[PDB]
Amino acid sequence: QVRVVQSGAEVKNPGASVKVSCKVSGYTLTELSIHWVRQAPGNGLEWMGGFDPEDGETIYAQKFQGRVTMTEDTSTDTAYMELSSLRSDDTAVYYCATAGAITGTPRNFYYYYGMDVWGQGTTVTVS
Amino acid sequence: DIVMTQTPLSSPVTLGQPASISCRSSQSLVHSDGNTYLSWLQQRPGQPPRLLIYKISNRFSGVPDRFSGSGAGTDFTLKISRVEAEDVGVYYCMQVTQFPYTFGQGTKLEIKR
Amino acid sequence: QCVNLTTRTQLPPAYTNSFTRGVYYPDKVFRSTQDLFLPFFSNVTWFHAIHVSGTNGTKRFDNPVLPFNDGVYFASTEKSNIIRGWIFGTTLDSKTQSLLIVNNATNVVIKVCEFQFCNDPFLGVYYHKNNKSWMESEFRVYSSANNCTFEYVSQPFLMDLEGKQGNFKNLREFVFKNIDGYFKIYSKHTPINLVRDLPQGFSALEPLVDLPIGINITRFQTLLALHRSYLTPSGWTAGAAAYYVGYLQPRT
Ligand SMILES: *[C@@H]1O[C@H](CO)[C@@H](O[C@@H]2O[C@H](CO)[C@@H](O[C@@H]3O[C@H](CO)[C@@H](O)[C@H](O)[C@@H]3O)[C@H](O)[C@H]2NC(C)=O)[C@H](O)[C@H]1NC(C)=O
Ligand SMILES: *[C@@H]1O[C@H](CO)[C@@H](O[C@@H]2O[C@H](CO)[C@@H](O[C@@H]3O[C@H](CO)[C@@H](O)[C@H](O)[C@@H]3O)[C@H](O)[C@H]2NC(C)=O)[C@H](O)[C@H]1NC(C)=O
Ligand SMILES: *[C@@H]1O[C@H](CO)[C@@H](O[C@@H]2O[C@H](CO)[C@@H](O[C@@H]3O[C@H](CO)[C@@H](O)[C@H](O)[C@@H]3O)[C@H](O)[C@H]2NC(C)=O)[C@H](O)[C@H]1NC(C)=O
Ligand SMILES: *[C@@H]1O[C@H](CO)[C@@H](O[C@@H]2O[C@H](CO)[C@@H](O)[C@H](O)[C@H]2NC(C)=O)[C@H](O)[C@H]1NC(C)=O
Ligand SMILES: *[C@@H]1O[C@H](CO)[C@@H](O)[C@H](O)[C@H]1NC(C)=O
Ligand SMILES: *[C@@H]1O[C@H](CO)[C@@H](O)[C@H](O)[C@H]1NC(C)=O
């Protein structure tokens, strides 16, 4: 169906942004919406933002307004999210999230699928 | 705003017997479509979570059978007719409609006898 | 980017008689001189491009590369738009010319380049995130085209999926000839509701287009509109595609 791969184990120093990618195999990147979520060590997950399939926009959570930019490029099929101003203490695991629309061409209804298939995740390494 | 909390602090269980858990919120979850949308998650240690349910009255494919939940009301539940050792991990309940899309608080599940 | 959805076991292609069908006009002054035509009461090979059985899954795919032998007669009976266009050519390879009639929603684009086909043509559809409507971009069919020689555009050959009367069936017809280096096509749209069988009565097909492709033709294959079956939780599918294929002869 779909396979999602990501890598964020780049060892670097504090005081800059971080980039995270999500290679999507299977459904083309123009077919499946995306979301994002963060889970710090010893802490639960947290929904940050994702695509609105019925609004054609990506909306962040109030906590993350203006902190991070998330974009995608169907030529490379790598959903990008550059989180700004990270340091060593903030290193943690970050995951992708994907879904699409349910109905066929003469559809009968939209769908808010949320998220159902996840990537392997990756600790955003800063040190 | 919509929260999602589960009544139990931890859920230590024993092999072979059924189990249940509850999840509570601050508002309803029924959608403008009339149909309500609900989901449940399961996570194994060192692994990303898998979606076990994507509506109040369904379960995801690939996951083990007998995985069921209370598909009605606003205090939905996750139930299985059995339990195994490899299922050790944590659980969560998630909503769909409220676009702020907050993440609920999970409950530890353990094998005890 | 290609898929093998056309796998199946050998299927006996049925047959049926053709009652005075496919007769068309050779001149330009009379409507309502030896040339290729379909003899009365001939045999027409009936196909099932997409078929179901048992669990009633659309597993029985097929779109075999029929032989383009002294022209072709073509026809369909349905109330949909699954069948889009056709591929004509000698060897359907990336070494010799070939023809493509890629009908789409608002136009028919006849193209002749050095296409590099896959083992099967698709022309499917899917959904585009940024806008809110389905898209039919289908580079799947031909992968690439090194050197081209001709192009064209016009109003679509096929009528719309009119669906004006649900108690009726649309019987579209066609006739293809490559006589003397000129590609000739006729057509006729006919209302019918009685039976699936090709009906009695004359049709008197009429000309549509003539283009100087200047190509040799021996193999022709048909195209379908397989829509991405976005899994409710394989790959592509459609519903009940069928058609007829007779053959012409120099008889007269
Ligand atoms: C299109 O081709 C099919 C397949 O050949 C034709 O099937 C017809 O099959 C019938 C029997 O099912 C054949 O009848 C034969 O009659 C002889 C007596 O002459 C008898 O000894 C045989 O046992 C058999 O019953 C018939 O040959 C055959 N029809 C034709 C025309 O060949 C189908 O009819 C063909 N349709 C057309 C429009 O040609
Ligand atoms: C059906 O086939 C026609 C083929 O003619 C497709 O339309 C053609 O392709 C594009 C449509 O955008 C046009 O080329 C250029 O597009 C850019 C935008 O990407 C535009 O800025 C240029 O001015 C130029 O138009 C081309 O003109 C257009 N031609 C025609 C005759 O429509 C069409 O997209 C296909 N699909 C459908 C649903 O019609
Ligand atoms: C389709 O396009 C491909 C593009 O690579 C064509 O490849 C062709 O390869 C032949 C090999 O002889 C080329 O002929 C040679 O051209 C070079 C200059 O480009 C010349 O120095 C050699 O002496 C020889 O004449 C050919 O030019 C090259 N591209 C072209 C223009 O065709 C392939 O042949 C093309 N097939 C066609 C035209 O359908
Ligand atoms: C059109 O193309 C076909 C290719 O299928 C040509 O057929 C070949 O013809 C040559 C001689 O003309 C034979 O030696 C080959 O064995 C044939 N092979 C095949 C696969 O057909 C055909 O000759 C070309 N021209 C015409 C008028 O049909
Ligand atoms: C199946 O698809 C692959 C894709 O490359 C192709 O190589 C192969 O010929 C197709 N058919 C079979 C029977 O594998
Ligand atoms: C989306 O629709 C608008 C409508 O004006 C059109 O201008 C634009 O080209 C379309 N974009 C895509 C990617 O389909």
Evaluate whether the domain defined by A2-123 bears CATH number 2.70.98.10: no
- Cα(A53)–Cα(C119) distance, rounded to whole angstroms? 35
The total domain count for chain C is: 1
Kind plus residue range of the DSSP H or E element containing A20 = strand A16-20
Q: Are C187 and C208 in contact (CB under 8 A)?
A: yes
Q: What is the domain extent for residue C198?
A: 15-252
Residue in A36, A53, A66 with CA at minimum distance from that of residue A111: A53
Residue in C146, C229, C158, C156 with CA at minimum distance from that of residue C189: C158
How many CA atoms does the CB half-sphere of C148 hold within 13 Å?
13
Domains and CATH numbers, chain B: 4-111 (2.60.40.10)
Strand-pairing partners, residue B36, are B30
How far A37 CA sits from the closest chain B CA (Å)?
9
Contacts of B40 (CB under 8 A, 6+ apart): B51, B52, B53, B69, B78, B91, B92, B93, B94
- Cα(C199)–Cα(C21) distance, rounded to whole angstroms? 9
Residue in B21, B14, B16, B9 with CA at minimum distance from that of residue B68: B21
C2 within a domain of the structure (yes/no): no
C10 within a domain of the structure (yes/no): no
C4 within a domain of the structure (yes/no): no
Minimum-distance ligand 5 atom for the alpha carbon of C2: 4
C109 within a domain of the structure (yes/no): yes
- Cα(C87)–Cα(C141) distance, rounded to whole angstroms? 10
Q: C198: phi > 0 → left, psi -120 to 50 → alpha, else beta; which?
A: beta
Strand-pairing partners, residue A36, are A49
- Cα(C150)–Cα(C154) distance, rounded to whole angstroms? 14
Instruction: Pull the structure tokens for residue B92.
Output: 């969560």
CATH code assigned at C190: 2.60.120.960
For the purposes of burial, counting CB atoms within 10 Å of the CB of C60, is it exposed (0-12), middle (13-18) or buried (19 or more)?
Answer: middle
Resolution in A: 3.9
Residue C231: closest CA among chain B residues belongs to which residue? B61
To which residue do tokens 């070494």 refer?
A: C95
To which residue do tokens 């955003």 refer?
A: A124
Question: Which parts of chain C are beta strand (E)?
Answer: 15-18, 42-48, 50-53, 57-61, 66-67, 72-78, 83-89, 98-103, 108-115, 126-127, 134-135, 145-150, 169-177, 183-192, 206-211, 219-224, 242-246
Q: Which of residues 208-247 of C touch B (CB under 8 A)?
A: 233
What is the SS3 assignment for C25? coil
Pick from C1, C5, C119 the residue to mutate for probing ligand 5's pocket: most ligand atoms within 8 Å of its CB. Answer: C119
Strand-pairing partners, residue C123, are none
Q: What is the CA angle B91-B96-B101, rounded to 5?
A: 80
Q: Are C221 and C66 in contact (CB under 8 A)?
A: yes
Residue in C108, C143, C138 with CA at minimum distance from that of residue C124: C138
How many CA atoms does the CB half-sphere of C198 hold within 13 Å?
28
* Sequence spans of domains, chain A: 2-123
Contacts of A83 (CB under 8 A, 6+ apart): A17, A18, A20, A67, A68, A124
Residue A101: closest CA among chain C residues belongs to which residue? C230
Contacts by C87-91, CB closer than 8 A, 24 or more apart:
C87/C117, C87/C121, C87/C220, C87/C221, C87/C222, C87/C223, C88/C176, C88/C215, C88/C217, C88/C219, C88/C220, C89/C215, C89/C217, C89/C218, C89/C219, C89/C220, C90/C215, C90/C216, C90/C217, C90/C218, C90/C219, C91/C218, C91/C219
To which residue do tokens 């396979």 refer?
A: A3
Which amino acid makes up residue B56?
I
- Cα(C154)–Cα(C104) distance, rounded to whole angstroms? 11
Q: What is the number of H-type helices and E-type strands within chain A?
A: 0, 11
C3 within a domain of the structure (yes/no): no
What is the SS3 assignment for C67? strand
Experimental method used, please? cryo-EM
- Cα(A104)–Cα(A114) distance, rounded to whole angstroms? 18
How far is the centre of ligand 4, averaged over its atoms, from the C-alpha of A3 (Å)?
46
Q: Are C222 and C86 in contact (CB under 8 A)?
A: yes
Dihedral of the CA atoms B86, B89, B93, B98 (nearest 10)?
A: -120
- Cα(A21)–Cα(A78) distance, rounded to whole angstroms? 5
Strand-pairing partners, residue A1, are none
C235 within a domain of the structure (yes/no): yes
Which amino acid residue places its CA nearest to atom 39 of ligand 3?
Answer: C147
CA C91 to each of CA C88, C114, C118, C139, C247: distance values in angstroms, whole numbers, following the listed order: 9, 11, 12, 20, 20
How many CA atoms does the CB half-sphere of C169 hold within 13 Å?
14
Strand-pairing partners, residue A39, are A93
Kind plus residue range of the DSSP H or E element containing B69 = strand B67-69
Q: Are C222 and C84 in contact (CB under 8 A)?
A: no
C221 lines ligand 4 (CB under 6 A): no
Q: Tell me, what DSSP letter sits at residue B100?
A: T
- Cα(B38)–Cα(B96) distance, rounded to whole angstroms? 6
- Ordered strands of the B19-25 beta sheet: B4-6, B19-25, B77-80, B67-69
- Cα(C156)–Cα(C154) distance, rounded to whole angstroms? 6
Minimum-distance ligand 6 atom for the alpha carbon of C131: 1
C44 within a domain of the structure (yes/no): yes
What is chain C's Cα-based Rg? 18
Residue in C75, B94, C97, C221 with CA at minimum distance from that of residue A35: B94
Instruction: Pull the structure tokens for residue C134.
Output: 């389905």
C9 within a domain of the structure (yes/no): no
Q: Are A86 and A17 in contact (CB under 8 A)?
A: yes
| Cα-Cα-Cα-Cα dihedral sign, residues B30, B33, B35, B39 | negative
Using a CB-CB distance cutoff of 8 angstroms, which residues of chain C are in contact with residue A56?
129-132
Residue in C88, C2, C69 with CA at minimum distance from that of residue C245: C69
Q: Are B60 and B50 in contact (CB under 8 A)?
A: yes
C165 lines ligand 1 (CB under 6 A): no
For the purposes of burial, counting CB atoms within 10 Å of the CB of A15, is it exposed (0-12), middle (13-18) or buried (19 or more)?
Answer: exposed
Residue in C72, C135, C143 with CA at minimum distance from that of residue C113: C143
Q: Tell me, what DSSP letter sits at residue C37?
A: B
Q: Measured between CB atoms, which of C126, C131, C132 is closest to A31?
A: C126
Distance of CA B70 to the CA centre of its chain: 10
